Amino acid sequence: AVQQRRSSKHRRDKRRSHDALTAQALSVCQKCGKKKLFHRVCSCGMYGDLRVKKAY
Amino acid sequence: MRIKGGKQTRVRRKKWLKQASGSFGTRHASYKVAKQTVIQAAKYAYRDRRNKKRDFRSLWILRLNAALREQGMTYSVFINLLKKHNIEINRKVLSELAIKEPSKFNLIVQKVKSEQPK
Amino acid sequence: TKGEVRGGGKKPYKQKHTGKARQGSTRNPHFVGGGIVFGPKPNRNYSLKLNKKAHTAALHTVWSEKLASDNTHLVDQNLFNKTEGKTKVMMQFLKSAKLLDKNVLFVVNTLNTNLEQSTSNIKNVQVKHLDKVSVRDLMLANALLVEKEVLKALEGKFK
Amino acid sequence: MHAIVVCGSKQYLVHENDTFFVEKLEAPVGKEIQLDKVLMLDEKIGAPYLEKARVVCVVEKHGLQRKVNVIKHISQKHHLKKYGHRQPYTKLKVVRFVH
Amino acid sequence: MIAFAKQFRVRISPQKARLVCQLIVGKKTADAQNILSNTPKKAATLIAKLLNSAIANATNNHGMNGDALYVFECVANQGPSMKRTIPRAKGSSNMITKRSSNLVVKLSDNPNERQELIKQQKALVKKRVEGQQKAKMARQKA
Amino acid sequence: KTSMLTKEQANKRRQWYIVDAAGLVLGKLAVKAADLIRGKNKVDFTPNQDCGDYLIIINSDQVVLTGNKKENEFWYHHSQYIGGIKKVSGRDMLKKQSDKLVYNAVKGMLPDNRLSRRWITKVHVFKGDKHNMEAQKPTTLNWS
RNA sequence: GCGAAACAGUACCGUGAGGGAAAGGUGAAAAGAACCCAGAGAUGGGAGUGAAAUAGAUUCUGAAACCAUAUGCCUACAACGUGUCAGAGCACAUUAAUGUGUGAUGGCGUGCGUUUUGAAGUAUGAGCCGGCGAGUUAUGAUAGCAAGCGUUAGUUAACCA
RNA sequence: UUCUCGCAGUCAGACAGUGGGGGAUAAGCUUCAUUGUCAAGAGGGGAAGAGCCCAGAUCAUUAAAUAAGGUCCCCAAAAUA
RNA sequence: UUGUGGUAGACGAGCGUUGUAUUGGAGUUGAAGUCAAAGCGUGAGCAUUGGUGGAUCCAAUACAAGUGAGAAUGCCGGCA
Ligand SMILES: [Mg+2]
Ligand SMILES: [Mg+2]
Ligand SMILES: [Mg+2]
Ligand SMILES: [Mg+2]
Ligand SMILES: [Mg+2]
Ligand SMILES: [Mg+2]
Ligand SMILES: [Mg+2]
Ligand SMILES: [Mg+2]
Ligand SMILES: [Mg+2]
Ligand SMILES: [Mg+2]
Ligand SMILES: [Mg+2]
Ligand SMILES: [Mg+2]
Ligand SMILES: [Mg+2]
Ligand SMILES: [Mg+2]
Ligand SMILES: [Mg+2]
Ligand SMILES: [Mg+2]
Ligand SMILES: [Mg+2]
Ligand SMILES: [Mg+2]
Ligand SMILES: [Mg+2]
Ligand SMILES: [Mg+2]
Ligand SMILES: [Mg+2]
Ligand SMILES: [Mg+2]
Ligand SMILES: [Mg+2]
Ligand SMILES: [Mg+2]
Ligand SMILES: [Mg+2]
Ligand SMILES: [Mg+2]
Ligand SMILES: [Mg+2]
Ligand SMILES: [Mg+2]
Ligand SMILES: [Mg+2]
Ligand SMILES: [Mg+2]
Ligand SMILES: [Mg+2]
Ligand SMILES: [Mg+2]
Ligand SMILES: [Mg+2]
Ligand SMILES: [Mg+2]
Ligand SMILES: [Mg+2]
Ligand SMILES: [Mg+2]
Ligand SMILES: [Mg+2]
Ligand SMILES: [Mg+2]
Ligand SMILES: [Mg+2]
Ligand SMILES: [Zn+2]
């Protein structure tokens, strides 16, 4: 099955209206300050008060 | 002598495109659809000039008829009374009187009501 | 045209069952390869015929209006060789005669060489024999200097 | 104060210092024209037309209306005719109502 | 006062880049960098490089303060495409169109910049009309 | 050219009215209700500004249908399913829901339009003498 | 315009005979952007040369279709060949003109070519844009119109200068 | 609308009324004669309709009188007996 | 005064493109091209101003045509 009529440039954008993106939640590390996405280990491997991995 | 087309096609096409300004999407972008819309819009305008002449007459008849029913007299007889009294006034101007100068409109109805025909 | 243009005399696509339209050659007029349907040809005539007496009548009237008019002075043999072959003297002559902007045409019967040596670097003026002037050269002149013996031959030619 | 005049074929209700547009009258700008056909004036309305009731008007301009393009087209019949129309008018303002 | 940076023939498609570009319009400098550094998209590590270069040449070349810059307009125009032949089945063939985007990011310090753009547009339209009037005075003069 | 006529710019002289349908015929009441709702009887009628007054109907169950229409004439409503065509006789409508019958009758006398929605909205029909619409201080007119 | 303005009968297709493309323009002069900043780099932003760098090697001019951004207007109870005639409100000010941009709302309204007795067509042709694309030439005949020459008229063909 | 000369297009028609043939006094059937329309003709009536009725669109006007048809509402316009 | 619906078709009058021949004129103080605007015509069409552009172009009278694109499941290029 294929469109017997071409879809205009307006119906196309109406369908894409739901394709917008969402900003992932970010937080501040409590020892170095850079922004990191929430509930995840920072770049230094320091999550909460526990040293997880060696610094980058 | 190889005559080459240029500035001739585009100018006569852009004239049609300019006329079809304010249309929905491709109906103003593409020359072909624009040309069809201008021709169709011209047909509508032509037919609706005639229809405007009739529809505005109807509105004057409607407003005057309504204005009359408040005084107890009807449209079918008001025009008949106008002819016997020889008074010649448009329904347009008569309706304009009844909306802007109610008192003077009542003067016209009072004379046509009872005064001797001619 | 379509036949002279180098190309394949075969059918590009099959006649049927292909989504493309029917085509018969790659050098058709509506193709980019280019076969001009009619086109200009190098066999055209461009020539026209006018009767002999009609040409005499046309020449007769053109002489009538140009002669007996302004800038239709008469010239003789002395100054046709007094030019000395130098175009500076003739430029002075045109300046003195106030014929600088005019397209003066010398009508000459004896083909003087000193006069022909000059007036050749001047794109404006020109000199012709009686058997060489035509209607167009006569009425493009706007001014002409005619020799006396040229005028006598003119009456003879008209008859 | 108000009058019902007949200029051309239309009837206009006019007040003092009112400018209305009528069909071309062939009169230069600035003259003082006298509209003749008057139906109603003040309160005395004449049956055919009022007698001696005159409307004094001054002609302001002799411009033309907006261009109208009449494109007659017979669908699928090889007929596309085009025409343009610019109807001339004249604008005039009421100065005085002759008794 | 617009500072800007450009990048020609970016491999990302304009369709997939405008989606990320709408996440950065109107944002402050520091907040703009933070959002783009933690978004799992391919067209995030290229606008970030362009954004950083634009900040650099705004506070170094044009001499801007640096704590008032906001992303004025970040868009991905359509760049030149590349045509390839993908071999299909039964002897047929299709055309793959490798799409490219021309990325440009622009940041300003004044929060009223749309007004100045309209002012130059108004000046150009205005500049056109007096010439018409000047031509009319000359025409009446003759 | 000529002088244009005066037209109201969405001017609202709309007022509230009360009518009593004690023994009025369905059609005779509906025709005047539509004329009153549309404002056609008004002196100045601009047919794009809904210059028509509100109207309230009292005693809907008390209306009458002449002849044998109470048992021989049927009102029809079909849902979008199959077999969802519900039929009610005149007598059943006059008892169970009389307000809906007058509502449908008044709506049917209006032009198919985007303004007819607001026009049918301005009809407040009640089945009893009581009504919660006494806060508008609606004037009383007879046979309308 | 020769298929071929460039290294074209080349690239490429076919076992082979054979078939057979596209692609030109910086600036007067490379003076072709040293140097600084961001970047891994290409590159970009400044600086510099230049009359011009929005002439920067992507290199004369840069159209439309197409894709994005934005000032202003409208749009989430609404049956729509999408326009037309009326018509509020909103926002501006012009080839000064009963001005321009949008259009709450009312009335009316089933495309363009083709071929048919008859097409909104459940017949047909076109996805859109731009370029190209179809009554000619040679030699004769007839008729209309006009000119030259005329009542032992009128007119030359080849060829020669 | 006759005569002479130049240039054509047309040779698939349709429906309505009237008189018939074929068909079954069936066909929006088929074949004729005649009056009209459409073809190549918009507007108004018929709710919507090529052919039925009223008629023939040069353009503009928000002027007036009418034809067929109609006057509770949609939708312009009525009352008496 | 009589008129002016119209397909096939007949007849008449004009517009526009390029070039040539004669006249005149404009142009680095900015030509053609090209975009925009609230202009002029009965129609093909024609101007004015401003931006971009960097070297040719315009008016009149004649002449000669590869002279007018919306459709051919048209060709080529680009883009949906
Ligand atoms: Mg869009
Ligand atoms: Mg989606
Ligand atoms: Mg063309
Ligand atoms: Mg060729
Ligand atoms: Mg294979
Ligand atoms: Mg090989
Ligand atoms: Mg640069
Ligand atoms: Mg490019
Ligand atoms: Mg370029
Ligand atoms: Mg709403
Ligand atoms: Mg609802
Ligand atoms: Mg409906
Ligand atoms: Mg509607
Ligand atoms: Mg509408
Ligand atoms: Mg419709
Ligand atoms: Mg055609
Ligand atoms: Mg057929
Ligand atoms: Mg359909
Ligand atoms: Mg089929
Ligand atoms: Mg077919
Ligand atoms: Mg198709
Ligand atoms: Mg095309
Ligand atoms: Mg002849
Ligand atoms: Mg027959
Ligand atoms: Mg037959
Ligand atoms: Mg019959
Ligand atoms: Mg029969
Ligand atoms: Mg029979
Ligand atoms: Mg039949
Ligand atoms: Mg036919
Ligand atoms: Mg008809
Ligand atoms: Mg009808
Ligand atoms: Mg006529
Ligand atoms: Mg009658
Ligand atoms: Mg009515
Ligand atoms: Mg005619
Ligand atoms: Mg020319
Ligand atoms: Mg220019
Ligand atoms: Mg051609
Ligand atoms: Zn950390």
From Swiss-Prot, chain C:
One of its GO terms (cellular component) is ribonucleoprotein complex. Keywords: Antibiotic resistance, Ribonucleoprotein, Ribosomal protein, RNA-binding, rRNA-binding. Residues 8-20 have a biased composition (Basic residues). Part of the 50S ribosomal subunit. Residues 2-33 are annotated as: Disordered. Belongs to the universal ribosomal protein uL4 family. This is Large ribosomal subunit protein uL4. Changing H17L: After 32, 37 and 48 antibiotic passages; confers resistance to various antibiotics in combination with a 23S rRNA mutation and up to 3 mutations in protein L22. It comes from Mycoplasma pneumoniae (strain ATCC 29342 / M129 / Subtype 1) (Mycoplasmoides pneumoniae). GO terms for molecular function: rRNA binding; structural constituent of ribosome. It comes from the Bacteria. Coiled coil: none annotated. GO terms for biological process: response to antibiotic; translation. Transmembrane segments: none annotated. One of the primary rRNA binding proteins, this protein initially binds near the 5'-end of the 23S rRNA. It is important during the early stages of 50S assembly. It makes multiple contacts with different domains of the 23S rRNA in the assembled 50S subunit and ribosome. Forms part of the polypeptide exit tunnel.
Swiss-Prot record, chain D:
PROSITE patterns: RIBOSOMAL_L21. The keyword Cytoplasm does not apply. GO terms for molecular function: rRNA binding; structural constituent of ribosome. One of its GO terms (biological process) is translation. Disulfide bonds: none annotated. InterPro entries: bL21-like, bL21-like_sf, Ribosomal_bL21, Ribosomal_bL21_CS. Pfam families: Ribosomal_L21p. GO terms for cellular component: cytoplasm; ribonucleoprotein complex; ribosome. Keywords: Ribonucleoprotein, Ribosomal protein, RNA-binding, rRNA-binding. The keyword RNA-binding applies. It comes from the Bacteria. This protein binds to 23S rRNA in the presence of protein L20. Belongs to the bacterial ribosomal protein bL21 family. PANTHER family: 50S RIBOSOMAL PROTEIN L21, LARGE RIBOSOMAL SUBUNIT PROTEIN BL21M. HAMAP family: Ribosomal_bL21. Part of the 50S ribosomal subunit. Contacts protein L20. This is Large ribosomal subunit protein bL21. It comes from Mycoplasma pneumoniae (strain ATCC 29342 / M129 / Subtype 1). The gene is rplU.
Swiss-Prot record, chain E:
Changing N112R: After 37 telithromycin passages; confers resistance to various antibiotics in combination with R114T, a 23S rRNA mutation and protein L4 H70L; requires 2 nucleotide substitutions. Keywords: Antibiotic resistance, Ribonucleoprotein, Ribosomal protein, RNA-binding, rRNA-binding. GO terms for biological process: response to antibiotic; translation. InterPro entries: Ribosomal_uL22, Ribosomal_uL22_bac/chlpt-type, Ribosomal_uL22_bac/org-type, Ribosomal_uL22_CS, Ribosomal_uL22_sf. GO terms for cellular component: cytosolic large ribosomal subunit. The keyword RNA-binding applies. It comes from the Bacteria. This protein binds specifically to 23S rRNA; its binding is stimulated by other ribosomal proteins, e.g. L4, L17, and L20. It is important during the early stages of 50S assembly. It makes multiple contacts with different domains of the 23S rRNA in the assembled 50S subunit and ribosome. This is Large ribosomal subunit protein uL22.
Swiss-Prot record, chain F:
One of its GO terms (cellular component) is cytosolic large ribosomal subunit. Keywords: Ribonucleoprotein, Ribosomal protein. One of its GO terms (biological process) is translation. PROSITE patterns: RIBOSOMAL_L13. It holds the Pfam family Ribosomal_L13. Gene3D superfamilies: Ribosomal protein L13. One of its GO terms (molecular function) is structural constituent of ribosome. Coiled coil: none annotated. Part of the 50S ribosomal subunit. Belongs to the universal ribosomal protein uL13 family. This protein is one of the early assembly proteins of the 50S ribosomal subunit, although it is not seen to bind rRNA by itself. It is important during the early stages of 50S assembly. This is Large ribosomal subunit protein uL13. It comes from Mycoplasma pneumoniae (strain ATCC 29342 / M129 / Subtype 1). The gene is rplM.
